[PDB]
Amino acid sequence: VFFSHWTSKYKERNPTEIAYSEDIERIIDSLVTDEITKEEIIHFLFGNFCFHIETMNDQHIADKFKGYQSSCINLKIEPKVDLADLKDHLIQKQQIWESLYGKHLEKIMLRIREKKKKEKEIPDITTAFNQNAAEYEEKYPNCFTNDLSETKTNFSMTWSPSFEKINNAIINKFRESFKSSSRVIYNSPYSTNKARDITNLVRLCLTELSCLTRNKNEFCMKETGRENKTIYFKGLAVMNIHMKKLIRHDNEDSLSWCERIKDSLFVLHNGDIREEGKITSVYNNYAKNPECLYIQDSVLKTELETCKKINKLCNDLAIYHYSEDMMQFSKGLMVADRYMTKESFKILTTANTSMMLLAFKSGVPYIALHIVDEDMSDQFNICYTKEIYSYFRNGSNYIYIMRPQRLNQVRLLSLFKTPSKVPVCFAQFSKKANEMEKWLKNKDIEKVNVFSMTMTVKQILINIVFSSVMIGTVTKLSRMGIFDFMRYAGFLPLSDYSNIKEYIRDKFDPDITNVADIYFVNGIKKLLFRMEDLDIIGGITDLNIKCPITGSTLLTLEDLYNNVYLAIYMMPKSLHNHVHNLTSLLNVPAEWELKFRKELGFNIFEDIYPKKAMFDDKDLFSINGALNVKALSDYYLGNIENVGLMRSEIENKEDFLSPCYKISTLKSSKKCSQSNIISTDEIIECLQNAKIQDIENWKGNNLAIIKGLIRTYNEEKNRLVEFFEDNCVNSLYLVEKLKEIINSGSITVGKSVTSKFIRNNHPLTVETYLKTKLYYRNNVTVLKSKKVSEELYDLVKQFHNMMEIDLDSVMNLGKGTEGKKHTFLQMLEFVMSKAKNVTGSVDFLVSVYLMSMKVKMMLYFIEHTFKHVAQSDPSEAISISGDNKIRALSTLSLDTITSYNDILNKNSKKSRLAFLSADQSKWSASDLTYKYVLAIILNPILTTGEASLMIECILMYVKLKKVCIPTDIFLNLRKAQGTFGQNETAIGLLTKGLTTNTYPVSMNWLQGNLNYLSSVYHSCAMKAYHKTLECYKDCDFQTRWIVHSDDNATSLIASGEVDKMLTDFSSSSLPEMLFRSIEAHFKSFCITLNPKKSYASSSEVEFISERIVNGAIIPLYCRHLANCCTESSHISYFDDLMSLSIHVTMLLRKGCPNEVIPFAYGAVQVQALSIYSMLPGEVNDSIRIFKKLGVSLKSNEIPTNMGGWLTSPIEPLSILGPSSNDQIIYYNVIRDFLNKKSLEEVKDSVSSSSYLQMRFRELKGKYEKGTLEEKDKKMIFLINLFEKATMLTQIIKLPNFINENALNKMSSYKDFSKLYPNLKKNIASSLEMESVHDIMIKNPETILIAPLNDRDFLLSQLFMYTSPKLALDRVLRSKARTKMTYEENMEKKILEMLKFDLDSYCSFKTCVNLVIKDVNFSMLIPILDSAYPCESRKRDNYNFRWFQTEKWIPVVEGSPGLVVMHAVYGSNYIENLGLKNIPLTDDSINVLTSTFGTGLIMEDVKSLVKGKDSFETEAFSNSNECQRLVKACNYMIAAQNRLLAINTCFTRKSFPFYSKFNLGRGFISNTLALLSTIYSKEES
């Protein structure tokens, strides 16, 4: 049945003694035990398919039986002759193999009892902390100094004073203040050459060196006095352009000092007088009157007043101005990172009235200068007691100079993210603080101020301000370590943790190097003290305290997790260096591979070797062997049901037996990282044909090769000598030629310039430098990065024997559908036959992970043949239908487990329940890979030959894998070992003294390569754990498991003799024994549990995120909240706004509070405007340009691609998405122009014909009479916008770097430059161009259709070429000429769109149709129009109970089928706006090639000269609007031919080829019920 097709030609091959390697023999020979012998394991493993015999075709059965008989012939075991002997032997095997699980149960019990009596029993957490300090003092002697005057800087490297006086005037004020007599007073850190030197340096730089100026602020010194030069050089010597000092965790003077620091911070912050700015404008637009963001404003008022009060407190406490100053000064420092030298400096001054900094040439060293009045000076001294060198008195003011500080680039970027980080932290902390919220509810907006707060509310505001300041501008690594510790140390309120005290004793790093992190340390210590002191309302009985913000009297448990994980997730990632980060990413496989090699006893030099017969139930790297086979056999028998139907479904859906370019994974523009090296023959021929008479005439690659060999000879002569010896016979001739070239003297040599040699030179120089430097009788390769769409083209050319491209060779074969094609598996076996030949094993090379095309195809085969095996398991959740399925399957697991326990607890003896939420420690490095070949062999889906191919792929992948080091990292490591170390770590042990580029890694299969097979093996291990647990005699067990890669969510319900079973398992609780038994079983199955980020509980489940307790979920919206303010795509403004509006929509879907949404809007808009299109008050705005030109559009009607602001209403944003604002403004303008009231009215008017023509004619008459109106001008502007333009596009697209200078790197362009000569590389051009279009117009399928077969792919790639760290770059690109400017480009563009123009009926009516015809819009808008505000079981509660009722629950009773009021939503992809742009582009390129053909055959094309029929029909199509006429024709024509490529050409030329060949037209969409996955906890 189902026509089982042989999808290979390896039918004669067998898994044993036919493949290249013999490792299967020793794999079988390593599985012999004392009771299972050689013939039994051979019989079971090579004939276990007999259980899958009632759903197999006869050809499949005969092929597998022949494979069994053959494999037993090579494996010297006499096989059985008929199937009956096979079945009898298999029932004997199933009995004796069944007698193993009691032995495994006794083994895991003995392992638990062995692991019990070894670890520790520590009394409490205070003793654990004291012990951890004791071992840290034992490792490093005499730390934890008691003198606080030698710690590090406290207030980061930025110190902002509020200012009272109202850009060169500030610098002149400082210059006139600095001219008084010297009365300086030096300061002690916690109660002096450096202060004197920095005072003299600042005094000189202010008085005498300021007025050779550049860019109005940057100036240097050359013609100065010798005394001034001495002062400047002493200042630069102070600049400098284990010795750690720590403090103990239980200090008290540090607490008192930190309290004084907090009060002085608050009284310093409450002094500002400014009231206008850039950040203030956008945040006040979004939060001062946020009622424009709602539709039903009157039903909630206290939330809006609370948001207004929070914004008023932000305005009062100078939060916006502090964030603005931080952003502008970080931008100025990033600009100051420039080619300016060490003798120049810059004066940074923002709109702050009297704050200055001096920036000099690891980071940027700088000094800050401040003016402080006599009112608040001692509080300034208390604040900055660590960071004040000098101060003096002038008039009624004090002048303060701070210490030099250094900033890195990513640190300046994190300072640049301050206006997005800080105000949302303040808003959510003030929202979550209970007594602050009740005080804000008590007071009215006219009366809130600091002076009328009580002591407690004042203190909690001080703590909130301090926490927000120290969280939003985090720079140093101590806070990173503290927040990582608090991330990993929140597991104490639960039953069993195994990291409550051992984690603190072992892995906690007490790296407290300064003050005011002790506040966070004592906060988390007090929380853990309360937790150890001993739906669910939390804090009403425990009376818990928040860690950062203290925040007493917590209402629910939902706030603690949200605030703590907000502090966790709002931290920057790469505060470590880029080179060090790549070293860390490349170095961990070296450690975890050499550990494996040294433990198993392999040495460095020898081969990988498959089996040392030590893979029998050991601890480090082993499996049980004879148990995994039985577990996989039972898993396959219980999972796979219909082999033939499943195989046919694989071949149909996953597209086996299809051409390779039809695979979407192997077609899209990714990178394959092939190896390409400049040829040694090319190098020696360049050296041979280099002419000494042409020393000045050398240009290009010859000059690059000459400079490379000159540098190689200058650095290392002997290696070049032996390279010439082994690569040329005339080595003396080459040496004397090189000597004559270096004695000519017309070339330039260089010294060791580190990374600059690769930075400012041609790549060929450094490639020939590396190749001539590292010749060690091998071929060192550096991987390039080619596209996969250009390797597939070369592979097809190689497969079809077209090594060199000919124009007639492609055209000979491939006429229509019946031409020559190929399939993916014949391609794959041709690839394997090519790769099995000796080629130096360059095919298997991984560079940081970029795997080759060959390996990509092989893991595509493995992963997509195991994907459908993974799809049939209901307890397995990697094959999900989106992110909804994970949460849905998790909550079905939890509620069915709770239901089964509630059933079981009635009338039973005893019953216990325990959950486990585990993450595995190292899923890739510590794992074994030879356990996977076993899972390949008993696969019943495959036949003989495909399983052998799979085994060949896995064995070659394991045995031949290597990892190559990048060039700059390799050179830096080499020079570091050469000049400092003369030795290296394990990365320099795998590589022979760093004399090799590649180091081998085999048993660590790389992350993400094998995702489905590993999860399948994890689920098999879980089922084997259940089968082991079932063998206990006195108790009844039930286990349920959820499996994702590197994850596990288990639960177990036990009944029976509970006290006896816990005494046997040697633990006091069911979570404790569950943790120990899962650890023992996973250790038996070569899976290493992580003992710190894993816990066993009785009520809480955490799969990947959003932990759920007792059937009720904690929402966890802080991930989206930190994502919106931290992470952005950084490609353009429109795309970043759309991509973060997706995150705003998701945050609205996850149930956030009301007060955070306007601040989130402000955060995304501040980020987008601050990077790309400058926030208002300066150049490159859009509202300023629209106001200057007098454009008819308003401030809130500008589209986002034109620079407009996101002003979508919240419910359409949540339901539709980021395109809803463009759709809404378009629909509003249509309704305003057509003088209609409703969507139904305008649809009924448009649907009747002879209407829009009449409107266009009367609008033309109005334009002729000059009686245009405001709505008419808006209509003309948007009509032109759609004509010259998700619905819309970027319009102004700034071109990237011109890669036409690198198009010679691409093989399709190289083939296009050969069969067509250099006339068309960049009268012969006319006739060649004419030949190109008549061979293009004879084949419309090539340029209209994605490739049906061959002669539709490679010549399409030829013919498509016819006719025409990163944050600093695009913060400077806008302020540059790329030529003209962006602002004048927008000026010229809008001046072009402002005119009426003619022949715009096509764009007008297509805009009208595309806006009106959308089904989701046409159903959503009347529901939003006619929704009653409250009551009738809709609005009852107020605690975030309108972000859940009026959003989406009426939306789902709307689009329909449901009844919920409160649920967390995971939405479908119902809205699609791309059902017309694809045929628009297809018919656009159709008219493009038609117009170019007719313009080539003659000029002035208005009507043709009656050529052929296709030319006549394309003339008729281009006479009118071609797209509009073909849409109007297909409105009633309904041909829909069968696409045989012969009858379509028979029927009619133009219209069938360019209407139906897109497989459809604009048809009606489909609407779903939004897929409410799971409830929230209901409130009423």
Ligand SMILES: NC(=O)c1ncn([C@@H]2O[C@H](CO)[C@@H](O)[C@H]2O)n1
């Ligand atoms: N004139 C130069 O070549 C120059 N100027 C500055 N540096 C760098 O300054 C550091 C030494 O002070 C090294 O990193 C150099 O590369 N080099």
Ligand SMILES: NC(=O)c1ncn([C@@H]2O[C@H](CO)[C@@H](O)[C@H]2O)n1
């Ligand atoms: N980026 C991450 O979130 C990450 N990185 C590593 N790990 C896990 O944490 C362990 C080390 O603590 C590793 O073995 C991984 O399982 N998690």
